[PDB]
Amino acid sequence: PMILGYWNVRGLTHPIRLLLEYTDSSYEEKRYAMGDAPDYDRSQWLNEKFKLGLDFPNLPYLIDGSRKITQSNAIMRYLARKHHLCGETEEERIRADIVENQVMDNRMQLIMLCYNPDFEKQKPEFLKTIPEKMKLYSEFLGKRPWFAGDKVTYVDFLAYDILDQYHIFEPKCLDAFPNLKDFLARFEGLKKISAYMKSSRYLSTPIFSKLAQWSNK
């Protein structure tokens, strides 16, 4: 089968796991464990990082026969193309391209805060900026059932993850935006998704590694 490698956390891999499941892909995972503080041992991965034939070794990685991929968005795009989950028009492509990138920025902002030793004092300033982020997603989606338009695309997998993550962080953050709450429900309502969420493989939390100040255990 295909092989997915990543840490034994949700991290930035959720969308891939979700996409593999929604597609009925035959895959096996390799979930690498990181030790606890203070050394945070990474040996399980480091022992093989340069032994898998990857061009730019990293986690996550996807091995599909002869094809070896790294960079989470590249993996998302490989599986999208294989299953026709890319935009079909120029308008759908542009919306997908922007959301892919926007998701990574809002993911980077969360990471920055959750790895900061000054987390508890930084937190208040971060919470103030949430409503603006959610507003932009809300206005972007509008009345469409999905981010790219009329049909589910690989970018709905990205968007679901980051909205979900922010919602775990600040549970009241979507109260003001009904179309976002509805989007989450719709996504989770997808049969393959609904199924997966009750499976032994589902890994919602922790989000971050042991080094983080939040969702780290």
Ligand X SMILES: N[C@@H](CCC(=O)N[C@@H](CS[C@H]1c2ccccc2-c2ccccc2[C@@H]1O)C(=O)NCC(=O)O)C(=O)O
Write out the binding residues for substrate. Answer: 115
Hey, what amino acid is at 196? Answer: Y
Q: Which residues contact 147 (CB under 8 A, 6 or more apart)?
A: 95, 96, 99, 140, 141, 153, 155, 156, 159
Residue pair 157/19 in contact (Cβ under 8 Å)? The answer is yes
**196, interface contact from a second copy, ligand X, none, CB < 5-8 Å by kind:** none
Rule CB under 6 A: choose which of 2, 4, 9, 18 binds ligand X: 9
Q: How far is the CB of 46 from ligand X (least distance, A)?
A: 7
205 binds ligand X (CB under 6 A): no
**Which of 74/195 has CB closer to ligand X?**
74
Dist CA 191 CA 188 (whole Å): 8
**Which positions lie near a second copy, rule CB under 8 A?**
55-56, 67, 69-74, 77-78, 81, 90, 93-94, 97-98, 100-102, 105, 136, 139-140
Q: How far is the CB of 211 from ligand X (least distance, A)?
A: 7
**89, interface contact from ligand X, a second copy, none, CB < 5-8 Å by kind:** none
97 binds ligand X (CB under 6 A): no
**Which of 35/53 has CB closer to a second copy?**
53
- Kindly report the three-state secondary structure assignment for every residue of 43-96: HHHHCCCCCCCCCCCCCCEEEECCEEEECHHHHHHHHHHHHCCCCCCHHHHHHH
- Which helix H or strand E contains 30, and what residues bound it? strand 27-32
**59, interface contact from a second copy, ligand X, none, CB < 5-8 Å by kind:** ligand X
Sheet holding 61-64, edge to edge: 27-32, 2-7, 61-64, 67-70
Residue pair 13/215 in contact (Cβ under 8 Å)? The answer is no
Considering only residues 14-53, where is the footprint of ligand X by CB under 6 A?
Answer: 34, 49
Positions in the binding site for ligand X (CB under 6 A) = 7, 9, 11-12, 34, 49, 58-60, 71-73, 101, 105, 111, 208-209
